[PDB]
């Protein structure tokens, strides 16, 4: 039983991506202090405990599922598509999410507001003509006051429907005050849609849409995400735990039940001695 760890994560042979102050979703959306993580790839994404959010207060229903599937895809390669939003103002932002010196927003999301004094029923489409899945990340804005709702969106109550040939997903945004986070009582709800190859995506919304700017190229492979404060190191090891890299010469380990790579199996016993000699009968 391997019961000790070196305390550091070996950066080979696995493509490690240390997320400094960035969560997976924060790096995905494009938080300013996560701008360095655009188009990154990894074999194992290491997520530090010190990661924080510094943008519009959002919320991800089924956050674990999205984190799991993004980690499994193993890439943050984002292809911007040309969406044509007619009759609305694009690239909305706020001073709670300060990109550069001025107000800003997530770099992968487009906040569409009313143009002039109207908000038409946006109805856009994108076909998936490629032979890989596309991941579209969109959102719904929940304002704090009805005055804000009508000031941003001429409709008194918008709705957002995102659909494919096989499934649909509709959200009725609500207006209400919420706990104060970074100066705001309004929220974003983050949803995702997977467009399989040869399928089409249709977005029909009459208000409160935080539209996508493109798609994330989905992949299949040996990628995952880990929560660990172990420091990265320049070294060789096939088995990674939150406690660092460990040698995989022994068949069992008692360090952690969370493992990655060609790792030993986790057992509750800290020691199991296997005799490699004969019965020992000494003199006297």
């Amino acid at each position, epitope marked *: 039983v391997q019961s000790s760890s070196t*305390g*550091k994560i070996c950066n080979n042979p696995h493509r490690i991506l240390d997320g400094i102050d960035c969560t997976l979703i924060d790096a995905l959306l494009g938080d300013p202090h996560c701008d360095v993580f655009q188009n990154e790839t990894w074999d194992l994404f290491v997520e*530090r*405990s*010190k*990661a*924080f959010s510094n943008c519009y207060p959002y919320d991800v229903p089924d956050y674990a599922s999205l984190r799991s599937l993004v980690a499994s895809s193993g890439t943050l390669e984002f292809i911007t598509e040309g969406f044509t939003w007619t009759g609305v103002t694009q690239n909305g932002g706020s001073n709670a999410c300060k990109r550069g010196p001025g107000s800003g927003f997530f770099s992968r999301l487009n906040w569409l507001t009313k143009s002039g004094s109207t908000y038409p029923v946006l109805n856009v489409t994108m076909p998936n003509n490629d032979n890989f899945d596309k991941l579209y990340i969109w959102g719904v804005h929940h304002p704090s006051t009805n005055q804000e709702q009508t000031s941003l969106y001429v409709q008194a109550s918008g709705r957002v429907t995102v659909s494919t040939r096989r499934s649909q997903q509709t959200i009725i945004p609500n207006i209400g005050s919420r706990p104060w986070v970074r100066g705001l009582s309004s929220r974003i709800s983050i949803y995702w849609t997977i467009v399989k190859p040869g399928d089409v995506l249709v977005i029909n919304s009459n208000g409160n849409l935080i539209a996508p700017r493109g798609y994330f190229k989905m992949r299949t492979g040996k990628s995952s995400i880990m*929560r*660990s*404060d*172990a*420091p990265i190191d320049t070294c060789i090891s096939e088995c990674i*735990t*939150p*406690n*660092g890299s460990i040698p995989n010469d022994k068949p069992f380990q008692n360090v*952690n039940k969370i493992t990655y790579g060609a790792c030993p199996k986790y057992v509750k016993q800290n020691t199991l001695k296997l005799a490699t000699g004969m019965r020992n009968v000494p003199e006297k």
Partner: antibody
Framework: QVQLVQSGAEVKKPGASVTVSCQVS????????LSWVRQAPGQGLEWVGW????????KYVKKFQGRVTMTTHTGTNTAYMEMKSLRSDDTAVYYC???????????????????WGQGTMVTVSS | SVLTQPPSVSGAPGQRVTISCTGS??VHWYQQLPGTAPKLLIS???NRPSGVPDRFSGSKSGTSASLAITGLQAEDEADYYC????FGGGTKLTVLG
């Protein structure tokens, strides 16, 4: 802005017990571990101990074992260090410093104390 | 396990200072200004954190780490400690006219 705000100076008598507090600001207490470091006046820095917030596991020096207790009030983003069986020699300035690792590793092995408090002059003597 | 260190360095503003620490077993250099909390000057034996001027530097040989201060001026005059858990003995850096 990341800030550690410590208690006021304490004047005690030998054999008592004292409780110093450290209020964090600009970040979440359970994201970072917290070391406590004493400095007698003009006698150089001295590592006292380390609390792993978010799981409550401690680490004190053998010199301080049994008579020092560290706790965290996560509701108020506060950490407390109490020194029991105060002696005259325990008069020193105590600092709470922020250390990085809390999950998978004990942070003080691999990470520095990047943010310090103003320190409290705990004087148990006269 | 033990850290050693030159005890006191007296110098004018504007020149180089080399301090050495000898770690028996990550070494970090801290500065304590007089009547102020200590500050982290370098981590990882060679990395300066945010806000530390690039004049500060660190070099690591097999067992001896060395902190070099360049363009010395007023605020550099302080006490300097090496850390690896155990602390160094301290190194007073006085100004000299």
């Amino acid at each position: 802005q990341v800030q550690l705000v410590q208690s006021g100076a304490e004047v005690k008598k030998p054999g008592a017990s004292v409780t110093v507090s450290c209020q964090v600001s600009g970040y979440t207490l359970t994201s970072y571990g917290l070391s406590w470091v004493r400095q007698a006046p003009g006698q150089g820095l001295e590592w006292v101990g380390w609390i792993n917030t978010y799981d409550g596991q401690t680490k004190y020096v053998k010199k301080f074992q049994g008579r020092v207790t560290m706790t965290t009030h996560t509701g108020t983003n506060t950490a407390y260090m109490e020194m029991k069986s105060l002696r005259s020699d325990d008069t020193a300035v105590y600092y709470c410093a922020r250390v990085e690792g809390v999950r998978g590793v004990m942070g003080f092995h691999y990470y520095p104390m990047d943010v310090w408090g103003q320190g409290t002059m705990v004087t148990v003597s006269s | 396990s033990v850290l050693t260190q030159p005890p006191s360095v007296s110098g004018a503003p504007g020149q180089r200072v080399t301090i050495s620490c000898t770690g028996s077993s990550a070494v970090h250099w801290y500065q304590q200004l007089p009547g102020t909390a200590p500050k982290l000057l370098i981590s990882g034996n060679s990395n300066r954190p945010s806000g530390v001027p690039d004049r500060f530097s660190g070099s690591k040989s097999g067992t001896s780490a060395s902190l070099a201060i360049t363009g010395l001026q007023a605020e550099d005059e302080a006490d300097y400690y090496c850390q690896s858990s155990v602390f160094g003995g301290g190194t007073k850096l006085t100004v000299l006219g």
